[PDB]
Amino acid sequence: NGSQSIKAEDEKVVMPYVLRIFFGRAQVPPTSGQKRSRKIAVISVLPNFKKPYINDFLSLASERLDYNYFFGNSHQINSSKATLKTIRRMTGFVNIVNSTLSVLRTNFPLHTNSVLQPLIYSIAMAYYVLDTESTEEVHLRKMASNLRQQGLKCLSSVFEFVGNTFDWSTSMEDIYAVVVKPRISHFSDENLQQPSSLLRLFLYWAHNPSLYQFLYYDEFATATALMDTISNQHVKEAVIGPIIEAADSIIRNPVNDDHYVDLVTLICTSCLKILPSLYVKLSDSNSISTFLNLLVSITEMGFIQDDHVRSRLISSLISILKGKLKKLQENDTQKILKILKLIVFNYNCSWSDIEELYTTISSLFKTFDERNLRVSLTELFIELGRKVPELESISKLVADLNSYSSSRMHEYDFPDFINEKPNLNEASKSISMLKDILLPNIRIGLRDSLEEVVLSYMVKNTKYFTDFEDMAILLYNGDEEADRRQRAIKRLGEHAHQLKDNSISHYLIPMIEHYVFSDDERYRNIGNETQIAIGGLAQHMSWNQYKALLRRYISMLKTKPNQMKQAVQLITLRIVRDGAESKLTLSKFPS
Amino acid sequence: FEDRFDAREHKDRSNKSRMQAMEEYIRESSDQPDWSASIGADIVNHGRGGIKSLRDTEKERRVTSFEEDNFTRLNITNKAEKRKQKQRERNARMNVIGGEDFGIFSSKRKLEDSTSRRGAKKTRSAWDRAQRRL
Amino acid sequence: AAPHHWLLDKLSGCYAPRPSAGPHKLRESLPLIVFLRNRLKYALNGREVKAILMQRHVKVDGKVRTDTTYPAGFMDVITLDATNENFRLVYDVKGRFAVHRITDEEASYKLGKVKKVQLGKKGVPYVVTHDGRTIRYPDPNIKVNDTVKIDLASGKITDFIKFDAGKLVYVTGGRNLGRIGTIVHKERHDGGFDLVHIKDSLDNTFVTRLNNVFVIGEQGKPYISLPKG
Amino acid sequence: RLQRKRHQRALKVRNAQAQREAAAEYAQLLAKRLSER
Amino acid sequence: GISRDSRHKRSATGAKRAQFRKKRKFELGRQPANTKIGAKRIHSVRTRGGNKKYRALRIETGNFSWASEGISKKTRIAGVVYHPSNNELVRTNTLTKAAIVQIDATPFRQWFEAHYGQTLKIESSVESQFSAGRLYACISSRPGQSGRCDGYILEGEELAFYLRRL
Amino acid sequence: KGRKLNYSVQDPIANYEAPITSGYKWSDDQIDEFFAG
Amino acid sequence: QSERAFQKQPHIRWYKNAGLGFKTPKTAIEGSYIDKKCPFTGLVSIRGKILTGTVVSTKMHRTIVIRRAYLHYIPKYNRYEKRHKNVPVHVSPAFRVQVGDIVTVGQCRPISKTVRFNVVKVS
RNA sequence: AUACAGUGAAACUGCGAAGGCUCAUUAAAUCAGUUAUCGUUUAUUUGAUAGUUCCAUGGUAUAACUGUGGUAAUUCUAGAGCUAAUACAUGCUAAUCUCGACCCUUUGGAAGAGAUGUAUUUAUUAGAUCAAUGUCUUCGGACUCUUUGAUGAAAUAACUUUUCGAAUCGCAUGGCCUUGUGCUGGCGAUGGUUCAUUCAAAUUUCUGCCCUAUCAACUUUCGAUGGUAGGAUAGUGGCCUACCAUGGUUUCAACGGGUAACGGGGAAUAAGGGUUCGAUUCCGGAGAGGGAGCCUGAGAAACG
């Protein structure tokens, strides 16, 4: 008969709204008691009478789900629903602790709340009943103790009711009457917030606009309290950033920066949070990261600091200038952030950024020589913008070489901090050399020569565009250096980049031989570069299977010579992974 | 191609090559005795049959061993007895003279073809025959 | 009318006992009548082996299973209550069913080759063996042709033997049926003559199939005891 | 008749309390294998 | 039907002298029950133990599926206009699998007006049938084997995929 | 067009029926003066 | 790529893998070809054995006629008369096989009256 | 033994018969092994395997049986009267599962929110990451490209004339005091849905002893060869039909010619001397007067 009544519900829509409201009115007239319970509360209730009431709430749920647009709603059905919900609350909170009929009437009450939320799920902007405050005060006096009750990952009876009441136009009258956002913000600022906290945050972010478009001054102060909740909930959207739904945070922070500027410490906290929005997770997308940096700039245009947020915005621009993502949109937002950071370093940054980012002109090569002849003492964002131009951004090749040489000149004129800046230059040149670049690899080689300012002739002859006598002199220089972990790793990386699967050129056997000779000359340095030799042999072993295995086989055979010389010298090690790699070679032998 | 379980090649045959002249020479040069009966006990029907041949007393010993071993008398199964007992006793009185069967001397069956002249150790190399001697 | 595996003497009868259906196949099993009556000879005829089956002395795989033609296949531990008879029967080197005698701590378990692992219904991992013990929930690293160890009091897998290069394997099938020695070679082809190869006294070589071979332990330590000569 | 109504209901609730608990009792062993894997 | 065997016909080599055998039970070809529109009558035939097979002949209540949301709802049948597995099958107006048949789409109107409010994002050449009532939909289920008429609606790409044909 | 329109002669229908001499009760002149127009 | 009616489509663009040492080309993973009976996306599953040989004719579409000459140790007239075999095979979106072209095939699920093999490799 | 109580003609029941003769001549297509069926049926064997409840027990209609009879007559019959079910078919049925605001510290979970199947046939998708023994140590960390591992490349929207949530029994009075069968309460066989195995069958990969070119062409003349879709199927399948393409086999032996094909092929046992006698499965498929159509079953075009 459940399947039969489900068929009756699936065919219970064929009659008009008059007959649907008449059948709903007959369903309401079972145990309404509007003479007894339309004033305040009910007169009496029973277990089987609540079972008629639980069945009435279930029939209301089935009727609303069947006719989930119109539902034939009536104030008699509303009064019967309020009488049933109040009788469920009264019986559950007035019965003794025996829990059988109490859990029956509690699962009657949760299902009745689900059927009540179904009415607003079906007929939301259709009725908007003007006597809402009766049921609103009834449900408030029932669920006053539901302060932090709806704070969970699945608690969505009163949380969904609050979201429905907040996502309307004029049904927020019961919200702005006394309180909805107070208890919602209490459970939102609860510290054990699960991932419905983002749902409540998006609901309040969408519901601040109705409280702002409302002409009532009470709703204006409630919108002020929603901005105050956005300022007092400065840990929830931080700690709940476990998914890629950071567009809600970027949509609230832009709304907050466009709406309310209430404290300089609040603007500094917003700028530091949007700095953590780019220094917290690397999976933030382009529009979200651009709007987050623009919201940090919008808080900084109002109430920024002069030293602390100055350095924070300078670090933000020093990351965003190395990024420059999304076809110069992030570069334009980074130039705006550097012009809003309000320092002397930021002033030189905005000058040397606007003088180069003038919409694809020769002003980039003009401004590189301009700041070279007029070298600025900030130099951090200058080295960022001149190392993005030294990377695979095609123009400013000689200007990139002059920028690296001028950074070396400043690092020699310092004579400590600018040597740690040269450490960052070397840690950038390492990832530049281990890459598929053509102009930026030559620029990193020029930076290696400027850091080297026999060895200088070797570097300039490795970057000589000749490659036959040049590679012969490189092999002879490796022989002279044989007769350095990261340094020889960088040299062998540049050599492997110049001979990296370029099988349209000859002497690849001597090129791999020079790679293995530099690897042997690094592996002779056992006290330092044994780890680097192990890493280079490991990367060559990964390349021995990664889609190409002709010259990598000879690289494996000639990197075995370091092991042969080490075993002849030993005449303790790690035999285990060596034997397992021997088993892997035996498996590659059965290919 | 592929393997196929062959009981006819891991079954104990040992009878294609069992020749009575070779077996008699082995019994002569055996240097361990032969379990012969007390002399009257092996004649059969008061002399109406033969004595009994060596294969017949071997088969009789096997039948009595199986007999005592699983407690069952053998039977008078008609088709097998009308073949084997009558044909066996008629060739017994044909060829068994005084407890000795002379049927083989009247039978064409080459000794060296099947039972001598080893097939696995054929030694078809001068080096293999040299290593087989030394 | 007999197979080769039963070690059945020819001077027995005319009709050979077809085993009934059961765990193993017809071609890889011996029933209880050819086990008890005419191999280790606890009976003399079918009437009295049915009599002792009605008396219920047999306790194969820890359950009684009173039936004459019950197909005891590979290493089903035949248990007999009187004189505490524990019999694990395996293959010899020339194709028959060598029934080794074992003790109680060894007959408290058996082992079984896994055939397939399934996501059958309702998220339940799943394992079958040659007696078809559909036991719940092994680890995810049960490949085909590994070896579970059944509990034999409940049904649970207690130990697990992984099939890889360097494991002690038993071959039941084809022209290698019943050999042990498991190491000269490994060769996994792509559809046939794919195996791990088995030594001899002079460490000779052999070819079989994957499904016709299954692991029993390690190089020197199988927890099954084996007969000798 | 009514004693059979006692025994039927008792064996039914005992069958439930055996099977529906043992099923989760080896599903938790699957959970242990998944945590250790 | 007759048969399922290669013995009555020639292979890829061209052989003769067939004269093979009395046909067995397991070459059982039943009669082709061309399912039509009528009053719902399903013949419950037996095969392979208790393998009851539902042979539908006059089925109506097609469960056809809204595609973009996957809403299989109940409707009637009108007629198949194009099905060149037999071009006389559409002349005789039967109902087989993978046929394109017409549906009065009034419960789909009810579901759209029930879970969207207003009446009429969806394509225009099916919005014309949203207005008129008869929409094209293709049968998925097998009434000759499973006895049912299920199907999927035509929505856009598959619509034009058939409308350019016929 | 293989099995389509075999213009052959078939065995059991070659004498399945037999004709009739007078046939139509009308005359052929009655046909001509029946549908001259 | 749609010359017939009745919703020419994959049957649940779609992509799978039979495994067992046979690659799937990138157009056969994500391409506009339907792969109704090509086993990489397909509806068929792989099993059985894998045979290798050159071809004779690829005249009709979805018909790859392999040749397969193989050694057999003849003891009768003690000389090897040379083998020849034929098998029709459905297409794959990986190689337009012309004359020559030693390729291999895997056994699966009889497609026409005489084809159980579908191409998985070209070399 | 005044509602049953042992013998038991004739009736329902469970099963029995669980595999027997003759006739016309098929060249790996009859047969034997083998590969596979996530391409499929399955009684029995074996291992596993069920959560939707509004204002003390459900209905006549038939036997056997009596009684009246017909007919030459049957395991042929018809009226009239009763009467039972594991026959027919309507219908009676406690509250336990996770996340846990709070914890009073161990006797730890009270509030709130989310739960709950099968059988049939339809669609979207769950089905790239983090942990170090190490890159730099700045003896702190952004760590995966290197050195090794891991989750990982049935959840839901509907039909169906939908099956069920034990009217089976045995062993054990046993525990409790809800003040009386108030709760019985412990276990095992038979049930009972589904999966897998086993059995058997059907297809299917390949292999296997006559001479054959005076058989050099066959195949489209039961689709020839393949593709697409449907029908039918236990399912794969030109197995059948619509449409389309003109294919496919062959001198590396297609296709065709016959018998000591009452003989042969291991089809199998071999025998301690018979060297093609010498153990057997099968010659081919049919047939129950003759073709045709239908039915039954886990299995059939049934020796019944």
mmCIF file of C-alpha atoms in Angstrom, chain A residues 8-128:
data_model
loop_
_atom_site.group_PDB
_atom_site.id
_atom_site.type_symbol
_atom_site.label_atom_id
_atom_site.label_comp_id
_atom_site.label_asym_id
_atom_site.label_seq_id
_atom_site.Cartn_x
_atom_site.Cartn_y
_atom_site.Cartn_z
ATOM 1 C CA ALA A 8 -1.849 7.854 -5.949
ATOM 2 C CA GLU A 9 0.624 10.676 -5.263
ATOM 3 C CA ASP A 10 2.119 10.415 -8.758
ATOM 4 C CA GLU A 11 -1.423 10.690 -10.151
ATOM 5 C CA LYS A 12 -2.684 13.099 -7.450
ATOM 6 C CA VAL A 13 -2.081 16.257 -9.528
ATOM 7 C CA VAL A 14 -4.540 15.838 -12.408
ATOM 8 C CA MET A 15 -7.271 17.958 -10.796
ATOM 9 C CA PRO A 16 -7.100 21.761 -10.534
ATOM 10 C CA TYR A 17 -5.844 24.022 -7.755
ATOM 11 C CA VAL A 18 -9.367 24.217 -6.313
ATOM 12 C CA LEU A 19 -9.636 20.436 -5.936
ATOM 13 C CA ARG A 20 -6.020 20.205 -4.746
ATOM 14 C CA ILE A 21 -6.649 22.834 -2.060
ATOM 15 C CA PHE A 22 -9.895 21.027 -1.178
ATOM 16 C CA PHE A 23 -8.088 17.699 -0.691
ATOM 17 C CA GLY A 24 -5.402 19.481 1.322
ATOM 18 C CA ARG A 25 -8.130 21.161 3.377
ATOM 19 C CA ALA A 26 -9.694 17.774 4.097
ATOM 20 C CA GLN A 27 -6.232 16.539 5.120
ATOM 21 C CA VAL A 28 -5.912 19.623 7.366
ATOM 22 C CA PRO A 29 -9.314 18.918 8.965
ATOM 23 C CA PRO A 30 -8.252 15.621 10.546
ATOM 24 C CA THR A 31 -6.756 16.951 13.792
ATOM 25 C CA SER A 32 -6.327 20.711 13.281
ATOM 26 C CA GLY A 33 -7.898 22.070 16.461
ATOM 27 C CA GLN A 34 -7.934 25.681 15.276
ATOM 28 C CA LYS A 35 -10.459 26.526 17.989
ATOM 29 C CA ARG A 36 -7.945 25.304 20.590
ATOM 30 C CA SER A 37 -4.481 25.795 19.074
ATOM 31 C CA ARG A 38 -4.584 28.854 16.804
ATOM 32 C CA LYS A 39 -4.148 31.167 19.804
ATOM 33 C CA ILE A 40 -0.964 29.962 21.525
ATOM 34 C CA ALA A 41 -0.663 26.185 21.864
ATOM 35 C CA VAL A 42 -2.594 22.912 21.986
ATOM 36 C CA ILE A 43 -5.033 21.515 24.548
ATOM 37 C CA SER A 44 -4.124 17.810 24.485
ATOM 38 C CA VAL A 45 -2.212 15.238 22.435
ATOM 39 C CA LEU A 46 -1.884 11.447 22.379
ATOM 40 C CA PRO A 47 0.551 8.896 20.923
ATOM 41 C CA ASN A 48 -1.892 7.746 18.252
ATOM 42 C CA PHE A 49 -3.095 11.328 17.771
ATOM 43 C CA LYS A 50 0.507 12.400 17.161
ATOM 44 C CA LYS A 51 0.740 9.432 14.807
ATOM 45 C CA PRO A 52 -2.190 11.035 12.948
ATOM 46 C CA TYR A 53 -0.202 14.273 13.163
ATOM 47 C CA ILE A 54 3.024 12.583 12.009
ATOM 48 C CA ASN A 55 1.027 11.078 9.152
ATOM 49 C CA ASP A 56 -0.380 14.555 8.459
ATOM 50 C CA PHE A 57 3.140 15.968 8.208
ATOM 51 C CA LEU A 58 4.119 13.043 5.964
ATOM 52 C CA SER A 59 1.075 13.654 3.761
ATOM 53 C CA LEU A 60 2.023 17.343 3.624
ATOM 54 C CA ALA A 61 5.536 16.344 2.545
ATOM 55 C CA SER A 62 4.155 13.978 -0.106
ATOM 56 C CA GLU A 63 1.650 16.567 -1.360
ATOM 57 C CA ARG A 64 4.301 19.293 -1.582
ATOM 58 C CA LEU A 65 6.739 16.920 -3.298
ATOM 59 C CA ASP A 66 4.054 15.883 -5.792
ATOM 60 C CA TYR A 67 2.855 19.441 -6.469
ATOM 61 C CA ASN A 68 6.276 20.953 -5.796
ATOM 62 C CA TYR A 69 5.410 24.307 -7.408
ATOM 63 C CA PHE A 70 1.942 25.358 -6.208
ATOM 64 C CA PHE A 71 1.061 22.688 -3.563
ATOM 65 C CA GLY A 72 -2.445 24.156 -3.015
ATOM 66 C CA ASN A 73 -1.250 25.971 0.088
ATOM 67 C CA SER A 74 -3.742 27.453 2.529
ATOM 68 C CA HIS A 75 -3.745 29.135 5.920
ATOM 69 C CA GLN A 76 -5.733 26.208 7.342
ATOM 70 C CA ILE A 77 -2.871 23.919 6.290
ATOM 71 C CA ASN A 78 -0.443 26.417 7.830
ATOM 72 C CA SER A 79 -2.348 26.472 11.132
ATOM 73 C CA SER A 80 -2.598 22.666 11.184
ATOM 74 C CA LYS A 81 1.152 22.480 10.507
ATOM 75 C CA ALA A 82 1.957 24.942 13.301
ATOM 76 C CA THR A 83 -0.352 23.067 15.691
ATOM 77 C CA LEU A 84 1.356 19.770 14.820
ATOM 78 C CA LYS A 85 4.859 21.227 15.227
ATOM 79 C CA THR A 86 4.008 22.857 18.557
ATOM 80 C CA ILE A 87 2.353 19.643 19.791
ATOM 81 C CA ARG A 88 5.470 17.695 18.788
ATOM 82 C CA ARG A 89 7.754 20.125 20.640
ATOM 83 C CA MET A 90 5.432 20.170 23.673
ATOM 84 C CA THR A 91 5.127 16.373 23.866
ATOM 85 C CA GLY A 92 8.853 15.806 23.333
ATOM 86 C CA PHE A 93 9.965 18.395 25.897
ATOM 87 C CA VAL A 94 7.191 17.683 28.424
ATOM 88 C CA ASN A 95 7.144 13.866 28.378
ATOM 89 C CA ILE A 96 9.319 11.945 30.835
ATOM 90 C CA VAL A 97 12.580 10.291 29.789
ATOM 91 C CA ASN A 98 11.440 6.941 28.406
ATOM 92 C CA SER A 99 12.585 7.829 24.854
ATOM 93 C CA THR A 100 10.410 5.419 22.822
ATOM 94 C CA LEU A 101 7.426 7.664 22.106
ATOM 95 C CA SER A 102 9.765 10.630 22.621
ATOM 96 C CA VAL A 103 11.989 9.509 19.731
ATOM 97 C CA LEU A 104 8.838 8.751 17.739
ATOM 98 C CA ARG A 105 7.603 12.315 18.319
ATOM 99 C CA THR A 106 11.124 13.642 17.664
ATOM 100 C CA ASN A 107 11.357 11.891 14.295
ATOM 101 C CA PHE A 108 7.840 13.242 13.829
ATOM 102 C CA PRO A 109 9.207 16.730 14.583
ATOM 103 C CA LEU A 110 12.213 16.501 12.264
ATOM 104 C CA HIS A 111 9.980 15.170 9.487
ATOM 105 C CA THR A 112 7.455 17.944 10.171
ATOM 106 C CA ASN A 113 10.248 20.526 9.926
ATOM 107 C CA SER A 114 11.315 18.856 6.671
ATOM 108 C CA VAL A 115 7.744 19.155 5.378
ATOM 109 C CA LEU A 116 7.654 22.791 6.520
ATOM 110 C CA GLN A 117 10.887 23.573 4.655
ATOM 111 C CA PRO A 118 9.333 21.777 1.652
ATOM 112 C CA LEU A 119 6.582 24.421 1.499
ATOM 113 C CA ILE A 120 9.162 27.182 1.110
ATOM 114 C CA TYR A 121 11.103 24.867 -1.202
ATOM 115 C CA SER A 122 8.050 24.656 -3.485
ATOM 116 C CA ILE A 123 6.100 27.922 -3.188
ATOM 117 C CA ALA A 124 8.691 30.477 -1.963
ATOM 118 C CA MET A 125 7.997 33.639 -3.980
ATOM 119 C CA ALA A 126 4.301 32.834 -4.432
ATOM 120 C CA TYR A 127 2.456 33.329 -1.133
ATOM 121 C CA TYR A 128 4.784 35.271 1.248
#
